[PDB]
């Protein structure tokens, strides 16, 4: 639709403007809860990994985190022009850009892919390529859910708007066993089941 | 930190002084929505869904990043010219999908705790620099105000196992060579 906006970087108080490096960061963060019912705008002014000044919508005014930016926070509160839009950015930026998340991000569903492969005995149930990164993966052995011999790696963010996880299982092969791997995910109305049989 | 159902980063303004380089990007739940090419003045969305329904003016970045260049020279003089501590990065190489000896796949090289954001990633196949089929994402923010970058390599698995991820950073004494085969 219309052009979106972002956090407004307030101006500093100075009188105008391995190798060494000076890094300056600024993050316009926003924390939504229960849809658009509990929006919280928290802008962070960071200098060399050290956050020295921040704004909070729950507070309403700028504050200095470290003794490095009292001159910035106290000056950013004095200017009525700066504090006027900074308070209004939660409605201008976040509460507005969140409405496009419903149309795009928050409606995105991706069905994962489940494969069981031994390693030679460790069994690996690899759930791959899914969204929105909410899954419940369980290992079973003939109607009984294994737990003690199951390794669960954390969620792996692939960076391409997909996720990946690996749930492993140590086992003793007994003839007649059937090792199913349940995978519960929002995009799936019914869970994906992949089995591995004990034979020979 | 703060507990919430969703966390969006509609700033992620970056500007360092080592090499006059910057980066503007929006992030939702850890993933990058887009990044503004500060040289070509273009908004590069990371999903086709965004290119058909989203919209963003790259001028906002140039207007915003210019403020960082002012605030950078500001806090440098207030902090007695305090440099940035070179944190030690760590590399983890894995695959996007279970690799089979015939069907192609995508290799992923994750580099975490990148600070300052001056890092390189080059793939090494059998000691040679693999150039065809290499992609990397822009710097992604972390809670501790560091960064992490992910690199990719489109390949087809075979008998060749030499698939390293050369990562050179100031926090490291020697360049790291992390190779992993499923």
């Amino acid at each position: 639709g219309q052009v979106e906006l972002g956090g407004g970087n307030a101006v500093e108080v100075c009188k105008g403007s391995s190798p060494e490096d000076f890094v300056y960061q600024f993050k316009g963060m926003c924390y939504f809860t229960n849809g658009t019912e509990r929006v919280r705008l928290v802008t962070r002014y960071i200098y060399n990994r050290e956050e020295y000044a921040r704004f909070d919508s729950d507070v309403g005014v700028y504050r200095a985190v470290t003794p490095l930016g009292p001159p910035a926070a106290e000056y950013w509160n004095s200017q009525k022009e700066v504090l006027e839009r900074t308070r209004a950015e939660l409605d201008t930026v976040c509460r507005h850009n969140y409405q496009l998340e419903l149309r795009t991000t928050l409606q995105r569903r991706v069905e994962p892919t489940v494969t069981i492969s031994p390693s030679r005995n460790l069994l690996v149930c690899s759930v791959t390529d899914f969204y929105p990164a909410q899954i419940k993966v369980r290992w079973f052995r003939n109607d009984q859910e294994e737990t003690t011999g199951v390794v669960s790696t954390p969620l792996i963010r692939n960076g391409d708007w997909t996720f990946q996880i690996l749930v492993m299982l140590e086992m003793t092969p007994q003839r007649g066993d059937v090792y199913t791997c349940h995978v519960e995910h929002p995009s799936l109305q019914n869970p994906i089941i992949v089995e591995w049989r004990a034979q020979s | 930190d703060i507990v919430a159902d969703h966390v969006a980063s509609y700033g992620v303004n970056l500007y360092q002084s080592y090499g006059p380089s910057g980066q503007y990007s929006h992030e939702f739940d850890g993933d990058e929505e887009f990044y503004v090419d500060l040289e070509r003045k273009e908004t590069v969305w990371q999903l086709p869904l965004f290119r058909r329904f989203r919209r963003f003016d790259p001028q906002f970045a140039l207007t915003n990043i210019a403020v960082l260049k002012h605030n950078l020279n500001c806090v440098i003089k207030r902090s007695n010219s305090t440099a940035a501590t070179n944190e030690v990065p760590e590399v983890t190489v894995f695959s996007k999908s279970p690799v089979t000896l015939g069907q192609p796949n995508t290799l992923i090289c994750l580099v975490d705790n990148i600070f300052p954001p001056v890092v390189n990633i080059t793939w090494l196949s059998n000691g040679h620099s693999v150039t065809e089929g290499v992609s990397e994402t822009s710097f992604l923010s972390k809670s501790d105000h560091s960064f992490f970058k992910i690199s990719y390599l489109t390949f087809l698995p075979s008998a060749d196992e030499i698939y390293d991820c050369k990562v050179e950073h100031w926090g490291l004494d020697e360049p790291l060579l992390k190779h992993w085969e499923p």
Partner: T-cell receptor
């Protein structure tokens, strides 16, 4: 422009001057600004708003809850309030300032 | 308020013009505009920290400059008949509300 205004507007001196403005295509991130200007002279900032009704000591501005339209209200229109009033929208993000047709207000004494 | 000099100016073809503007004390975002009856208010370029943050679609003959004390300047080269206008100066705190100055009424004649 993303706004529209009536160009023919006059009212009696001392009485209220309600200058309307319609901006149905405005977004939740665009402010509403009002500028007046005597020709051959620099424009003058009056008042700006996003939500609710705001009042500067020069004039008041009301915005409908649906944000479709807004009106600039002058309490007691004097002879000096006879310029051309512009109603514009802005992102307040270092963007440009674009004017439209405006409203040529004439204060009949 | 916003100081802008000179007030009036009469030039001919081929000459050049250097316009100056002192913004409001505390402001450091100077925007330039050209106001004509046939083109309305057209954006020129904006200077913030001695750099050109935003720029319109005007030829290279329209250049600008800014100093440490936030005072900005604007130069035009090879003036044409269509360049005669009221050149306005908008002082802004940063990205907030812009306050215009008196303006320089320029006139180019043969």
């Amino acid at each position: 422009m993303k706004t529209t205004q009536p160009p023919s507007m006059d009212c009696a001196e001392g009485r209220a001057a309600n200058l309307p403005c319609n901006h149905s295509t405005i977004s939740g991130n665009e402010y509403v600004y009002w500028y007046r200007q005597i020709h051959s002279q620099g424009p003058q900032y009056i008042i700006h708003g996003l939500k609710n009704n705001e009042t500067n000591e020069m004039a008041s501005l009301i915005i409908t809850e649906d944000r479709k339209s807004s009106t600039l209200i002058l309490p007691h229109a004097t002879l000096r309030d006879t310029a051309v009033y512009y109603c514009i929208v802005s992102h307040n993000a270092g963007n440009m300032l674009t004017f439209g047709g405006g409203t040529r207000l004439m204060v009949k004494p | 308020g916003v100081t802008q000099t000179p007030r009036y100016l009469i030039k001919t073809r081929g000459q050049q013009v250097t316009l100056s503007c002192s913004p409001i004390s505390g402001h450091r975002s100077v925007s330039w505009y050209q106001q004509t009856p046939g083109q309305g208010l057209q954006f020129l370029f904006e200077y913030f920290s001695e750099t050109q943050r935003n720029k319109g679609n005007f030829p290279g003959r329209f250049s600008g400059r800014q100093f440490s004390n936030s005072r900005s300047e604007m130069n035009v080269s090879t003036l044409e008949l269509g360049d005669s206008a009221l050149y306005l100066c908008a002082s802004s705190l940063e990205r907030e509300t812009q306050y215009f100055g008196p303006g320089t009424r320029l006139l180019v004649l043969e």
